[model samples]
Target: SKKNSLALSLTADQMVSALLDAEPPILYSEYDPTRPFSEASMMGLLTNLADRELVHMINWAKRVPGFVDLTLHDQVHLLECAWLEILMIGLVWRSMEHPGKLLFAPNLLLDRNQGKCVEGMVEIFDMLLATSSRFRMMNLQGEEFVCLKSIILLNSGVYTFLSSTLKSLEEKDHIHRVLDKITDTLIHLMAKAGLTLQQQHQRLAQLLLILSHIRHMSNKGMEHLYSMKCKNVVPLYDLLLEMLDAHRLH
Candidate 1:
């Protein structure tokens, strides 16, 4: 019994168009190489990049066709849940083009040696590098990358609230449909790019596999950020602090 919600109304092609339109502009993190390497500066470098990207990420989400129509509580809730995922997906994509390195920003590319600035970070580095290698192996295309990102954003927030306490079920129903259309666009775009039927099926599974990896990595990602925040190593964004505070990771 869905009404005339934009989520229900958007065709797959239209959804693709909306996703492409709302994408954040390409930008790089600021860096100063002359600054001596230290735990604090390395943490600061990452936090600053995340802070800048977050500003754009918020604006991008708000522009997603039906995102703003949700109650303010839900909007905030979704962002709090999914921001790390969004950040990680973008990080993974940027790093995909270059193996053995993470493009934290266009100006700041860090390999394992550089990533070692923070202790107990080996696993997080391994996860990001391994995921990027898989992405490169799959030859993940740009349209496909953006589509996967939207899925991460949608599922992390959408399903969590739906299964438990949400402001409204019908509205969750709408977002669910929106996610379906987004997935449809991924299939259509892959087909148009000349993937064969079997390849399309296999590719979908592979992407989902990678997504599940992101989910796991995102939690560790939160944990990594929390370590920095708790240590007061960097000046985290006010919004970043608010969202991280909401996480309350164990």
Candidate 2:
């Protein structure tokens, strides 16, 4: 029991460190301000960021206790389902510094109206900026962010077209129990900061509601990418294109 507890605690710490320790450094963006921002350049910047975040997410998931023990099929399935939400979580956290805008990188900012060039992104930006505002209001710490991310990463919302149901009731039960422990830990983290019981409940509800918004964004994002791909508007390279396929969070 002590071993399990210690391992879970370590996993919590690992997640916070890996995903929320500091803002990610901006990668080199060769944006030519002299020329109008082409759709190709926009997608290229986006693709690079997604690829980097997905790699971090996969590494972090591997360190989570029960995750690696799953069959590779199930593990890949979970990563596919969870990667987009994790990306959104990172984006929301980063956006705290600048509300009402989507921070793609240190150099690039996407205003809601910037969606004029990209099809269907204006609505997604509105939802994201709104959710980002709520997250900032909550003033979430690393503990709460990590806990929420774990739940989003492990939950059943992501299961869709597995060849066979890799999720046994037993595995589902185990995952949910782990989720409960993380939530309890999160409450303790908040209580230490002087949040009342009612405040705690409200925070939890708001965080879960943000997750719902993320779910909506993930599906809509998939559709938006599909349309872009069909129109051949964005020059998605090989690995980035592969990542789009793997990380299609539906």
Candidate 3:
């Protein structure tokens, strides 16, 4: 019996034991293959973790259940502050290329919602940035759905679309400059936050291509708008499909 117990102890590793725990195992804990507790594995672990959500962890946090405590005004104010931050970003983006465009009947979704979308996505980043020493650790882990990708990259993609359209319209040099500023913000955020140089470059390239697509869609809309004739957007939709198909991205 003693020999059998000794052999079982030798074979059942600590990690195996932890996961196999039957009663009230730790909630939302994860194992990072990249971020081994050892110093040697730290860097890659940090990169991987930077983009992951640790959802079990996130869910646990959310369930702490303070949902009804905030006053309605404060809750609304929070969303409003988020909106204002988004608006400012978009305003600066447009000031250079499309003066008074906001007052005009420009597409509300493209002009207004784009900024709000970016800011909405960043709210989580803001929370994490405020609270986590994991920012110091720079490691992330999660499932495909749970993982957080770079927001700067996503916004850059949106901006990339706008810049291409505005610049072609011969919007002044400052329009181009503002686009540059947006991108620079993206790059600096990723770089200072410990994203690998390679990761940064990949994001830059993705933003460029995505922006180009956004611009193409925008231009297509304008062309139709000017014609005073409604044409099938199916062709444009097909082209977009072709792009995704080509990339096998879907």
Candidate 4:
């Protein structure tokens, strides 16, 4: 059970709220660990948007299931990667679904949860990470959407600015690292899990569809940001290609 607190980051609160509010109708007893992940499964519906990221990680991590168990620092790194994946997903969701996506986006929450997602990950890191079913249902209902949308400003970074920020995290002090690890783990544990697959191409295409959605929205976001004369981010367009490149090598 997650405590609801004001001092907590709104994003964190949103995540906790989403999880606490979730009441996924089905019992998880039937989940099969040994079965090859069926793209048609509930997990598949919740996770398909994250396929590219799973593809990218499989290459570098030699399969992501292993990264969830590395030292806390390594786990945090993986969490950061996962957050990036979520960010991209949020952006894409925005671009699609007409009548304005932002109003319903960020429906999938990913943030530094002090270990929400990571703990679930730690409990059973397999080819496909399993999430608490109830939480996924809440995400589907859009309870966490706003928090997810809020992160987009940070997600669009593809240039040196965002890359530099990503680089800085690599050197955060011990306490910061520890806090981030906790946050990362909790997010994975309490928050809904996204898509992760064991195969290639299928995963790769799903990821691209997601990224394209984000890239389109970010372009619109760029217009707004430019009006304020803000510096651009990591250039998601190129980054998408880079992500693809990373996937290809996998």
Give the alpha carbon lDDT tens digit for every residue of 1-250 in model 4: 2222322343544444543343122111233445543323323322343334334433433222222223454443434433444443433334333321211114332222311332232222120111122223233334333323222212333221223344344423222333343243334433344533332334334333434445453344323323222222222333333333332222
Q: lDDT tens digits, residues 143-209, model 2? A: 6876777778787343443543434544455556666766766666677778899988888788888
lDDT tens string, model 3, 131-213?
22222232322110011111221222232232344332332232233334434545555675577999978755654443343
TM-score, candidate number 4: 0.24
- What are the models' TM-scores? 0.92, 0.82, 0.24, 0.24
The worst-scoring run of ten residues by lDDT in candidate 2 lies at 1-10
For residue 162, model 4's alpha carbon misses the true position, in angstroms, by 8.5
Best by lDDT: 1
Candidate 2 local Cα displacement, residue 3, angstroms? 12
Candidate 1 segments whose C-alpha is farther than 4 A from its true place: 162-167
Sorted on TM-score, highest at the top, how do the candidates line up? 1, 2, 3, 4
Task: Pick the winner on lDDT between candidates 1 and 2.
Answer: 1
- Candidate 3: regions farther than 4 A off: 1-171, 226-250
The lDDT values for all models are 0.80, 0.67, 0.28, 0.32
lDDT of 4 at 110: 25
How many collisions between residues are there in candidate 2? 0
**Best TM-score among the predictions, by candidate number:** 1
